[PDB]
Write a protein that binds this ligand. Structure first.
Ligand SMILES: O=C1CC[C@@H](C(=O)O)N1
Length: 301
């Protein structure tokens, strides 16, 4: 028998965390107890920027993390964060299908196995005051959570301030941040109605989360156990996509029930974020190589 420890980024409230828990449970049942994965969630073991290295170094054998957390190191890992490139689930899914094998190859070269992915819901904007154009956010201390969102915020004219998910309520309370961009899932997870008032259904992008394993640890399992992990992962990826699609509206309704103003994306903001998206995909294409171009070709196929 083998025991693994897994890190998961988000609290037990969060559906990606629940999907990882069910994945751990399904691995245990499918291997008849030969592999047990114990999940420590809410980034208490490793924080988002620490996950990849913790998995590589064997702090944990497996972990869940935002894909675009690897973006600074390798650009292919943040294509899911380019504004308005793939803002519907159907586009996101096609983008993911083109992105995944490239990521799996880039990770394998690093001693990491890509087990499965699942999407967050589309990213909206949360604010303390009404916003109708980028000007409203000029000089605003605006939460960033990745290299891509830091860059995006700067282009918006805001002052990017990196805050990891568990620290968001604190950061609002002490005035470190005054606005943010995130899904309605994080909005409900963190009960954001206590600290912000307006949510704009921007669908700026749909960032992926993935579950990645230490290759040496993975390779040491019996063949059948390795396959059970991959199959349980496949089921998790399907479950993850279905849940995100099924829950996006319920989560948005939850924000409104709890007194947030929930609004569609204002047209000037829509225009300006689209222009920001054009810049970023150009910026991205330059720093991605031919691998980048074959990804974009595959997507736009
Ligand atoms: O919807 C999302 C994307 C990343 C995560 C966060 O806010 O950090 N929640």
């Amino acid at each position: 028998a083998t025991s693994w420890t897994m890190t998961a980024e988000q609290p037990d409230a969060n559906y990606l965390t629940q999907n990882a828990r069910q994945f751990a449970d399904e691995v245990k049942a499918a291997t008849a107890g030969a592999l047990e994965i114990k999940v420590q969630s809410n980034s208490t073991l490793l924080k988002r920027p620490e996950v990849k290295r913790g998995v590589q170094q064997g702090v944990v054998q497996i972990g869940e993390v935002l894909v675009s957390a690897l973006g600074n190191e390798d650009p292919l890992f943040e294509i899911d964060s380019v504004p308005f490139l793939a803002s519907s689930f159907n586009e996101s899914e096609k983008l993911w299908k083109a992105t995944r094998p490239l990521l799996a190859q880039r990770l394998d070269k690093q001693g990491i196995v890509l087990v499965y992915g699942s999407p967050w819901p589309p990213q909206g904007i949360y604010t303390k005051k009404p916003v109708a154009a980028l000007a409203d956010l000029k000089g605003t201390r605006f939460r960033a959570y990745s290299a891509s969102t830091s860059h995006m915020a700067a282009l918006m004219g805001a002052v990017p301030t990196t805050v990891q998910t568990p620290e968001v309520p604190q950061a609002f309370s002490t005035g470190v941040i005054d606005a943010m961009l995130t899904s309605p899932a994080t909005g409900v997870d963190s009960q954001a109605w206590d600290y912000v008032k307006y949510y704009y259904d921007a669908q700026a992008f749909i960032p992926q989360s993935f579950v990645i394993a230490n290759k040496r640890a993975f390779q040491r399992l019996p063949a059948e156990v390795r396959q059970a992990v991959l199959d349980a992962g496949a089921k998790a990826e399907i479950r993850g996509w279905q849940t995100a699609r099924a829950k996006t509206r319920e989560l948005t309704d939850t924000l409104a029930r709890n007194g947030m103003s929930v609004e569609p994306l204002p047209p000037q903001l829509a225009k300006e974020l689209q222009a920001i998206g054009a810049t970023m995909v150009s910026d991205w294409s330059k720093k991605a190589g031919a691998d980048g171009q074959q990804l974009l070709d595959a997507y736009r196929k």
